[PDB]
């Protein structure tokens, strides 16, 4: 993925191969390019911030790098050749002989008109400088002055995208015209409003994040990386979620890959027997204390590792507001599009 200048790309920092793998995966190569992480999950009620598919997450886990993803974007441009004269040039525009300049900061551009790798671009900055010569007989209905011999054709960044320019490429196309491609990098961190899913149709959003002190803990000082609600189990009858939890816990405690292929001889009682060899309550329950006051909890809690995947929907890509702004040419009504700040 390092070279390719795709329109969009997402990469995960640390991927983990699942603790419970089907035998067929050895042909899809899912243990070479995983798509999630093993998260400790405690199924419980705790403070009422995980109801109706929400979840609660440990903030220290976030801070140490769990579910952190790189993001990569790219843009392209090329010089156009109208007629026989080159009507577009790659050069840093100057306000002396240019009209209709954009409010973005042209300062970061080099003399070539192309920004250089390693510069923190931001909202509405420009990364490619493009100037269009205009024939003298063409006047913008009195807008043009005597010295405005050229027009601006630069490409500003999308209004929200921020980050660091990562690569710049110069080539030529079939017609011999110049060709520039810019690739930009960014980092994405989970936050209230993201989207996560398990392998059994159980997906939700983060509803609040807690620090390790307010997290309920076991007698051994272990803390759940996340907490889900038990009101999601009955009507969905996802017993495979519970079985996967139990088997993954046994494999983590033991240290060997646990088969979970369909139509085989593994049973629940067998893995419960293998669990009790290690020293835990056979049905996966455990004793946990309250994080605030330190007391004991009346009811025990189902506890163990699972596999989760970070889906493609972030709240930063869905948030939009508008007081006023551009209209439409024909109907004169607010435009369509979030990237074009419409209604």
């Amino acid at each position: 993925y390092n070279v390719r200048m795709d329109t969009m790309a997402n990469i995960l920092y640390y991927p983990q191969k699942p603790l419970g793998t089907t035998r067929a995966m050895e042909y899809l190569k899912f243990r070479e390019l995983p798509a999630g992480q093993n998260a400790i999950v405690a199924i419980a009620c705790y403070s009422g911030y995980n109801q109706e598919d929400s979840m609660i997450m440990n903030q220290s886990s976030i801070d140490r790098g769990l579910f952190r993803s790189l993001f990569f974007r790219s843009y392209m441009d090329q010089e156009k050749k109208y007629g026989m004269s080159i009507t577009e040039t790659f050069e840093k525009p100057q306000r002396t002989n240019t009209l209709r300049m954009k409010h973005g900061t042209y300062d970061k551009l080099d003399d070539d008109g192309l920004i250089a790798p390693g510069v923190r671009v931001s909202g509405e900055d420009v990364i490619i400088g493009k100037t269009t010569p205009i024939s003298p007989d063409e006047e913008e209905l009195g807008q043009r002055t005597a010295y405005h011999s050229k027009r601006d054709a630069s490409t500003p960044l999308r209004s929200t995208e921020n980050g660091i320019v990562d690569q710049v490429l110069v080539t030529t196309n079939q017609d011999g015209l110049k060709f520039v491609k810019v690739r930009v990098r960014t980092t994405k961190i989970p936050q209230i409003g993201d989207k996560f899913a398990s392998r059994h149709g159980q997906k939700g959003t983060i509803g609040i994040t807690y620090r390790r002190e307010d997290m309920p803990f076991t007698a051994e000082g272990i803390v759940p990386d996340l907490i889900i609600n038990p009101h999601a189990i009955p009507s969905r009858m996802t017993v495979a979620h519970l079985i996967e939890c139990l088997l993954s816990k046994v494999a983590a405690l033991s240290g060997n890959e646990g088969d979970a292929s369909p139509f085989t001889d593994i049973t629940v009682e067998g893995i419960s027997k293998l669990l009790r060899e290690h020293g835990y309550q056979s049905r996966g329950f455990e004793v946990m204390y309250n994080g605030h006051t330190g007391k004991k909890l009346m009811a025990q809690i189902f506890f163990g590792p699972t596999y989760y995947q970070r889906l493609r929907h972030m709240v930063d890509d869905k948030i939009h507001a508008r007081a006023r702004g551009p209209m439409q040419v024909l109907t004169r009504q607010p435009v369509e599009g979030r990237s074009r700040d419409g209604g």
């Binding site: 936050q191 609040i208 807690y210 002190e213 006051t293």
Partner: protein
């Protein structure tokens, strides 16, 4: 992004008072005391110590929303006795207990090092 800065958990803003005391209008000899930039660590300790005074009737605390670091404490004591005095006695007792605990731990650790 709308994520507030983390240092707002332990640095008071300018014009902020660490304590705010307000008389309670329902029960006689009752005060509501707001603490800023603090969480259960202090409120639980202070309430558990205030429950040991035979002249203290009521002592309860709460943290209304887990976004903001602040909490409320409520005290009610017997006639002829000031809730602020009760708070002062509780803090003194806590400090003495912690000092004794530190001395004991240091003695035990040094004894272990001698036995190490």
């Amino acid at each position: 992004m709308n994520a507030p800065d983390r240092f707002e958990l332990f640095l008071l803003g300018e014009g902020e008072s660490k304590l705010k005391i307000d008389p309670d209008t329902k029960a006689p000899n009752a005060v509501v005391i707001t603490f800023e930039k603090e969480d259960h660590t202090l409120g639980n300790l202070i309430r558990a110590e205030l429950l040991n005074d035979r002249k203290v009737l009521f002592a309860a605390y709460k943290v209304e929303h887990p976004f903001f670091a602040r909490f409320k404490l409520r005290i009610q004591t017997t006639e002829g006795y000031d809730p602020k005095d009760a708070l002062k006695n509780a803090c003194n007792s806590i400090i003495n207990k912690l000092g004794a605990l530190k001395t004991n731990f240091e003695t035990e650790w040094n004894l272990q090092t001698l036995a190490a």
